Design a protein around this ligand. Structure first.
Ligand SMILES: O=c1ccn([C@@H]2O[C@H](COP(=O)(O)OP(=O)(O)O)[C@@H](O)[C@H]2O)c(=O)[nH]1
Ligand SMILES: O=c1ccn([C@@H]2O[C@H](COP(=O)(O)OP(=O)(O)O)[C@@H](O)[C@H]2O)c(=O)[nH]1
Ligand SMILES: O=c1ccn([C@@H]2O[C@H](COP(=O)(O)OP(=O)(O)O)[C@@H](O)[C@H]2O)c(=O)[nH]1
Ligand SMILES: [Mn+2]
Ligand SMILES: [Mn+2]
Ligand SMILES: [Mn+2]
Lengths: 542, 542, 542
């Protein structure tokens, strides 16, 4: 029962006690509660936090009640200690985490390059129970999108032809016309889906998909049935956990959202950004994106020194490439940046790298893992946090918060979107309703969030759309931390600085982030990259 | 497992289902939840209510989300059923109540006329465990007030003398000048109390009181020590439960309020209006005001008929008076209205009344008592409900609500009052701060409540002050019912009509309300009665 | 009198002569003309070219007249020889070029960093007569733009405020709104200018500018008069040639265009892209952009070897940086990329670089220069050709062609634009007229050009606008080469491959292109860079 930095009643009395002034009904409130807190040795760390929560709230009443009170400045300082005490609770009182590596891939067949990445973990970590999530009901979501978007491109290009050299028809006008069609196609499928399921509530997703492709886009069903069969085998053989078995999630409120982004929006990224944390909440372990690889040993390459010209992320990227050239664990893991090196140092790798026998000497394993029940550790790329590496304890207080954050965001989204979408109109007129309504219900807190939310329809068919990040992605995790440290719930605007977020960083040595497929994930839909794609599409038909 | 009037999923679908329109993410929300409700046979009545609560809330989202939806008018009607279903839950599924008569008397020595009233209950109800609450710490609150107010009157009258026939110095100007002094005296005692308790946190209330009277108002302590001793004996002998033993209440949040109205405001009525419901919540039984008497038998006087001229409340008042003339259970229970009768009918009573042996044939006993865990039955005088007769089951859902109502009201009060009182000023300048701040933090809901709250300082030293009723009294109980039926929490403005409140009426036959002391408690501080008191005070000194 | 590769009459007869077929009136046409060509030893190289021109034209008649003729395939091959013969004429028969370095800077005061770059040339090349062109009439064009665009940004940002978080108001919508204002301001100045000059045809540009700034944008004239005076001194001292003295250009047709881009569009880049070639045509020498620096010696750094990681353009960029660190010819020429190097090789430079005395050992001079009267050599950056380095002989045949190209392009522009602009309307409605009319008068040759031309209004106030390049810039020079080799005049679509253009490349060793200011000029207005500027502007006002 560590007392921590947090001050004792008598100390706080000494911190404030202004001369010739009695104690109020509302000031003693803090003292009686703070005294209680220090007597909670036997109680859980989470129960200690909720007592701080109440203390924090009690103090900000006492400063708001009397804004004259000279105490304030001291009580303003007392708030700081509470934060530190929360951090001290986090770090000091740790619990063993459940040894469960989680992966997720839904919407289509699992790719082999993904499985190769998974196996790397699975090999070195024999003790961990790996669970690569999938969805039996939805193997044809990805192919549904693929068929539509491509069939929407073909239509859009032909609408131009007679205006191909006309400089009004630029990349912007193209995607805008494409999305107009994509929305119409995507919506049509929805109205079919929400009439087929309304008719026969024992039809799965795929059954509606395959039939939709058959009638409209002229696809033979038997070819799809071999695909789903080939998929189900491939995942089942590779430690496949179905989401339909995980009914704890389906019974939860976040499921509606999972399906929404899966079936209605064909946003697999979003769906997977939900499932991952909802998994950690109810199972406990480490979630990884499939593009991730395990940590290289600190020692392995401690003798070699870095070049001056090349950057640090380039160095870490080659450290990985070196492995896959000589030990050859993965088929043709590009040796691009390794062949952009000096031959003398290339041989330095070849020599020292081949001077180890098997895989245990290469990659460091996880083994025993400790983390607080208040925290959910998260990875850091160059540009902030990222939800590709999530350590968590079963039913963590943060893990909860993060889900409640996601739930509430989608609440605000749907409680503005669903009105607009229902009264069916053209894409453009829908978007101009959806946004208008958002801006009405948008204060000076959620302002910075709401901006991004307004682009929600455009997610995946437009450049520069960070909406999905503000829904199921990093922002939410940031908010949850703010919820923690501000002793509140449902913070939407983030005012936490990088340094504050570091308190929840998964140690860098556990995850080798600088993989090939992550640089393929990091393509980043820049406005410029879009233009070249338009030129490429324009090349195809002619 | 009674289904009740509440409609089944498929019925509600049929109620709304508009032609050619699909079901939304937000409409199915009701259906999936309503379906669940009907499958909760094994669950508690309270758990059923919370499921209705959530249903009610889900429906009012669905109507607010889409205000075009033609469904609305049907879903507007679905809300009505939910209320009825709550009422059907209340009435149909009953539980035996704990056989505990509760009485309360705090602030001073218990009066004998009060004890005589209590014993009447105690005699006929042998099975019930009676508990007459008291407070050992506070026997001298009432005498503290008595000493101050009287010493404030004496000062006020002498300030006039040289302006006695001047018509500016009316009853209004008198009480206004009196209160100005009373506040100053009352506050002085507080600053002493909150410095003595701050100095020696092992001093009780009385110890601070007796010393305050000794130094200032020239009272011999030993005379008080005989008073408190004579009191403690008198209550202990008469089934005395101390509030200091009932620590469950002291640990609760409502205790601050109990002391506030006891020690700071000397409002015994308010303190007792809090304790009564907080008792019912944690003990369960029937609370009665001490001025109440048990129910006369339906049969006893069924042969006699009423006069045409005299009113119905006069008849019930004499029915009681008749008992105490001939059977003589209570010393000189005024035979006023019985002697304002025809002698022929006087003898009709004398004859038929004396034609019964002992007390069991007179007063009907309570015996076994059933009530819902959702409800807290309350008495009805001529002018609405009244908290003089409260049946309740242990930890009722209403009993909770009522306390949470009282808690929140005092929250709003103190969160405006305590700012103003702290920066000590003249009474008038304090009141004009306290109110100003209330009117700032006052919307169109709490408006009607807030009005009365602004008179909080004047409670007990002014005519026409209904504040205490809007804090710890009826209004709160009304609100709690509104909270119930509107499936909300923290309703402040009441829109329930008498008929709606009847759903929580304690059957009239259980309580004989028309007692002597209740007509003495119903004096009602009218502005006119005040004037005559001023004239009476003005008589005294001259 | 070199005969060259071109075949003699009798040879060409042997090339075609199909058996049993007489020679036509139109076939002998080539033979009689080809025979003539070979007898023109005494004639000028330019006169030889025009004879090839006529030959080329005669042959393509003979193949078009009779499309059956089996000769065609041989005469198709004869066309190839003519091209080669033109190239052989170019290379073999050379003439000394006039030793005149030309620079240009108009619109505002000449910058010191520009002058420092110029002096580098001027020092090492003592024999060359340098001429830094300027315009006395227009020193305030740049400040006119600066005042407008900035005053248009300020207006545009304030139009947002109440929509700052609304995601409709993106970077695209900003510039679009800005340009709408900029056009209105820019046009207003024009209508004033073309009414002031119409009134008093002895008023210069500046006099109209300074007055325009005084009345509208609240500028004190005397501050401008010191600016123009400070400028005129600064240029006069640094080998300043005025364009108003060069009346040979003013009398030419291309002058209208010079003023158009100067006074009407405030496009200094365009104006300078015209003057440069019109200078070479009538003066002869080497034109350079001011951001250019002279060639580093082949020998100087022949001992040092390149790193493997860093790119080749990085190496050439540091070669320059190295000079300016130790020999220190120019104030704080950024030592960025030199400090991103290995210290061992840094010292390799420091050592070997400081092992030379004065500047002659560093930079290679030009001295005597030979080039054909048919050619105008042009520089090559990574992307393609570039008009930053132009060698030419006085009144070259190419130098002519290039001007005639520019003249004709602006013809097509104005003959579509001036109609639309005259009937004054909103910017948008003007642009939608201007383009519509272009697309009407646009065949399958000029198609690729016309696209870019339609963005002519947006030049300088929008991202991704290559119009100016297709008017006065590279494309024109490419066309002129196509005009040469296709024996045509007024080719608009270019079908020349990089390899073909190399025939007119200024040897790489003469120009050090990889300067600091050129990397500053190569910023390239990418759509993404635009967004960050919008965010930066949005930061400023708030
Ligand atoms: O068809 C797909 C593709 C991706 N994903 C999920 O989307 C995540 C995003 O990974 P990626 O590297 O593509 O995105 P990043 O976050 O690295 O930009 C993956 O981890 C998968 O869980 C999925 O569920 N289905
Ligand atoms: O000195 C006193 C007088 C009254 N009461 C309480 O106040 C209640 C109100 O009784 P009364 O009939 O005087 O008031 P009413 O509500 O009828 O006006 C009583 O039942 C007691 O519980 C008390 O605590 N102390
Ligand atoms: O205010 C200015 C700026 C530039 N220029 C001319 O524009 C040319 C373009 O040089 P820069 O390197 O800025 O452009 P880029 O390299 O992008 O063609 C310069 O050489 C100058 O002759 C000019 O006349 N006035
Ligand atoms: Mn990735
Ligand atoms: Mn009463
Ligand atoms: Mn440049």
């Amino acid at each position: 029962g560590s007392g921590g930095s947090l001050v004792n009643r008598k100390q706080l009395e000494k911190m404030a006690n202004v001369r010739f002034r009695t104690q109020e009904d509302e000031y003693v409130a803090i003292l009686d509660a703070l005294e209680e807190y220090h007597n909670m040795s036997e109680n859980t760390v989470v129960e200690k936090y909720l007592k701080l929560k109440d203390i924090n709230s009690l103090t900000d009443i006492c400063i708001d009640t009397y804004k004259k009170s000279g105490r304030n400045k001291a009580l303003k300082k007392f708030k700081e200690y509470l934060v530190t005490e929360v951090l001290e609770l986090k770090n000091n009182n740790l619990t063993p985490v459940e040894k469960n590596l989680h992966f997720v891939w839904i919407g289509g067949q699992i790719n082999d390059t993904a499985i190769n990445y998974i196996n790397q973990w699975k090999d070195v970590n024999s003790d961990y129970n790996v669970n690569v999530f999938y969805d039996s009901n939805a193997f044809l979501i990805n192919t549904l999108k693929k068929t539509v978007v491509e069939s929407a491109i073909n239509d859009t290009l032909e609408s131009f032809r007679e205006n191909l050299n006309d400089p009004r028809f630029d990349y912007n006008k193209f995607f805008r016309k494409r999305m107009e069609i994509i929305y119409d196609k995507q919506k049509n499928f929805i109205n079919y889906y929400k009439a087929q399921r309304e008719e026969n509530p024992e039809l799965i997703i795929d059954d509606i998909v395959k039939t939709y492709l058959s009638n409209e886009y002229s696809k033979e069903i038997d070819e799809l049935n071999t695909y789903i069969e080939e998929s189900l085998n491939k995942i089942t053989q590779n430690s496949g956990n179905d989401v339909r078995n995980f009914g704890e999630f389906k019974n939860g409120e976040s499921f509606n959202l999972y399906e929404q982004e899966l079936v209605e929006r064909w946003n697999l990224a979003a769906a997977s950004d939900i499932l991952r944390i909802s998994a950690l909440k109810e199972i406990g372990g480490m979630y990884l994106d499939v593009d991730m690889l395990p940590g290289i040993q600190p020692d392995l390459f401690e003798s070699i020194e870095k070049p001056s010209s090349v950057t640090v992320d380039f160095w870490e990227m080659t450290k990985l490439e070196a492995i896959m050239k000589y030990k050859e664990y993965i088929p043709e893991y590009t040796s691009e940046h390794f062949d952009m090196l000096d031959e003398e140092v290339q041989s330095s790798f070849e020599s020292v790298l081949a001077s180890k026998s098997d895989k245990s000497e290469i990659f460091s394993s996880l083994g025993d893992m400790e983390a607080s029940p208040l925290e959910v550790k998260i990875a850091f790329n160059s540009k902030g946090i990222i939800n590709q590496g999530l350590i968590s304890v079963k039913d963590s207080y943060c893990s909860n918060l993060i889900v409640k954050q996601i739930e509430n965001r989608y609440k605000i989204l749907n409680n503005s979107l669903n009105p607009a979408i229902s009264e069916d109109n053209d894409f453009n007129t829908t978007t101009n309703t959806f946004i208008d309504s958002i801006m009405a219900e948008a204060n000076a807190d959620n302002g910075r969030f709401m901006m991004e939310l307004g682009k929600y329809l455009r997610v995946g068919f437009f450049p520069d759309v960070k909406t999905t990040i503000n829904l199921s992605g990093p922002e939410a995790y940031a908010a949850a931390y703010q919820d923690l440290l501000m002793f509140k719930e449902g913070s939407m605007n983030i005012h936490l600085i990088e340094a504050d977020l570091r308190n929840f960083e998964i140690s860098k040595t556990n995850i080798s982030q600088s993989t090939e497929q992550e640089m393929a994930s990091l393509w980043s839909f820049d406005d410029a990259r879009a233009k070249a794609q338009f030129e490429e599409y324009k090349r195809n038909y002619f």
